Amino acid sequence: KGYWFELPVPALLPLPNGYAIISEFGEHYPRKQAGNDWFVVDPASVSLPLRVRTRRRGDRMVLKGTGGTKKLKEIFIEAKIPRMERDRWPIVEDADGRILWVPGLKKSAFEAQNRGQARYILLQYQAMNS
Ligand SMILES: [Cl-]
Numbered sequence: 640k641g642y643w644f645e646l647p648v649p650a651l652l653p654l655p656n657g658y659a660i661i662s663e664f665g666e667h668y669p670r671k672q673a674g675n676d677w678f679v680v681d682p683a684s685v686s687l688p689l690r691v692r693t694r695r696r697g698d699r700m701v702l703k704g705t706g707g708t709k710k711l712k713e714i715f716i717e718a719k720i721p722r723m724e725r726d727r728w729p730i731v732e733d734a735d736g737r738i739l740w741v742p743g744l745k746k747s748a749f750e751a752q753n754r755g756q757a758r759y760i761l762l763q764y765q766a767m768n769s
Pocket residue numbers: 668669670671
């Protein structure tokens with residue numbers, strides 16, 4: 640039940656788990672309240688293209704601030720995610736394999752800060768329900 644996508648931008652990318660990832664370019668840094676279902680990337684500071692793929696064992700990501708490095712498995716357990724939905728859960732990495740974001744669950748230190756960059760990549764994670 641595994642998958643792997645190169646993530647174009649702009650794009651709306653339906654996923655085998657019933658969710659979609661939407662990408663687009665934006666000039667401005669987001670103002671919305673912090674949440675795990677959106678993400679901001681600075682193209683200049685991360686290796687493109689982005690990919691979205693399912694988990695492998697050993698997968699770890701570096702948390703914001705002094706959070707430290709955290710194994711993805713631990714994140715799924717703490718979130719009480721059913722074993723079947725984790726095997727199917729999108730993981731957003733850069734072209735180098737750095738895990739940037741686990742949509743809906745956790746952000747890495749690699750999320751853009753508001754630093755006067757000319758342009759950002761904006762990501763959104765949303766269900767195909769209603
Ligand atoms: Cl906004």
